[PDB]
Design a protein around this ligand. Structure first.
Ligand code: 2O5
Ligand code: MG
Ligand code: NA
Ligand code: ZN
Length: 344
């Protein structure tokens, strides 16, 4: 029971886990190892480590036992057999969001409640993901698309599941928040998860560009944000950036993530084919070109996003940008010798 107290998870390798978690505050954390040494409970482990590191459990009076119970059922509601959108991906976005919240240009800009909302949003943002895209769910007239009227169908679902889990007995981690804190937290979390809908990517990016065009900083380089509206706009872009962070990690990590997203796409493609539908872009293992698509993904989606975020917080994200360019160069080099999914 002491290593649960220390880690929030059972582990046969306490020492290895602890050494991996020394990188908790770094972009170079290896979440695959964390999964390895945590009996495959990366989200519970990384969330417990994050909440301990930021004193969130103290500040908001969240019982660590109730937290672990909530995080274990949340993590169970991610599907192990979905190749990318499983609890490892959620863990990674939560850890990446945790690192982005400490970027020096944002120092002291956000409230504690904002910090809590963003990390919690990251943790729940893909829960109960079925391994197929919104468009597939819309095209197959699925119950989820009927329920949510084709609008941010999975994202609404992730939120509903995340919040419904809080009403299970013994799982309400926010019980000691005041009513006003619970209301505010709820609104911010909804906002941020809905912002992870890829079809909002271009509108988010445009808004973010306006914020770069108008940015002002103190003479120490800290961003000056005027009101709630400015801050939530940065936080929704932050979570969106963390969700699209895989190509800004070390190549060894990025390649693992790409193998996973492609397996997931190919599995959807097989579903589409089994039922005689036209196979979606990227989902046909026969015609796919993994390297070229990554290069396209970076050039048209990931790079423009991160170049703008980098402009907003400069110079704090320059290295993340350098890695993203370097990785683009690697994928480009391995080519043998999209856009509608991110718009409307
Ligand atoms: O599947 C969707 O409809 C929305 C979506 C799009 C992209 C992602 N993530 C992702 N998407 C791609 C990707 C690559 C090429 C084309 C397209 Cl549409 C997406 N590549 C990667 C690499 C970083 C691991 N990740 C997740 C969800
Ligand atoms: Mg999602
Ligand atoms: Na599960
Ligand atoms: Zn995600």
């Amino acid at each position: 029971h002491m290593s649960i107290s220390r880690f929030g998870v059972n582990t046969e390798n306490e020492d290895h886990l602890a050494k991996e978690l020394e990188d908790l505050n770094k972009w170079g954390l290896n979440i695959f190892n964390v999964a390895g040494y945590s009996h495959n409970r990366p989200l519970t482990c990384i969330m417990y480590a994050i909440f301990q590191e930021r004193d969130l459990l103290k500040t908001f009076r969240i019982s660590s036992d109730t937290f672990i119970t909530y995080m274990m059922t949340l993590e169970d509601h991610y599907h192990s057999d979905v190749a990318y959108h499983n609890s490892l991906h959620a863990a990674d976005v939560a850890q990446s969001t945790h690192v982005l919240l400490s970027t020096p240009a944002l120092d002291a800009v956000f409230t504690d409640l904002e910090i809590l909302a963003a990390i919690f949003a990251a943790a729940i943002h893909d829960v109960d993901h079925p391994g197929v895209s919104n468009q597939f769910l819309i095209n197959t007239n699925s119950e989820l698309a009927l329920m949510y009227n084709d609008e941010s169908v999975l994202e609404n679902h992730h939120l509903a599941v995340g919040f419904k889990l809080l009403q299970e007995e013994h799982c309400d981690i926010f019980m000691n928040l005041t009513k006003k804190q619970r209301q505010t937290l709820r609104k911010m979390v909804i906002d941020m998860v809905l912002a992870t809908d890829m079809s909002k990517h271009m509108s988010l990016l445009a808004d973010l560009k306006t914020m770069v065009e108008t940015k002002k900083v103190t003479s120490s380089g800290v961003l000056l944000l005027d009101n709630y509206t400015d801050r939530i706009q940065v936080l929704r872009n932050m979570v969106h950036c963390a969700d699209l962070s895989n190509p800004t990690k070390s190549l060894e990590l990025y390649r693992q993530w790409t193998d996973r997203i492609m397996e997931e796409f190919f599995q959807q493609g097989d579903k589409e084919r089994e039922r005689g539908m036209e196979i979606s872009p990227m989902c046909d293992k026969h015609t796919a070109s993994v390297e070229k698509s990554q290069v396209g993904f970076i050039d048209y989606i990931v790079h423009p996003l991160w170049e703008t975020w980098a402009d907003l917080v400069q110079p704090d994200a320059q290295d993340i940008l350098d890695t993203l360019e370097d990785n683009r160069n690697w994928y480009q080099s391995m080519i043998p010798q999209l856009m509608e999914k991110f718009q409307f």
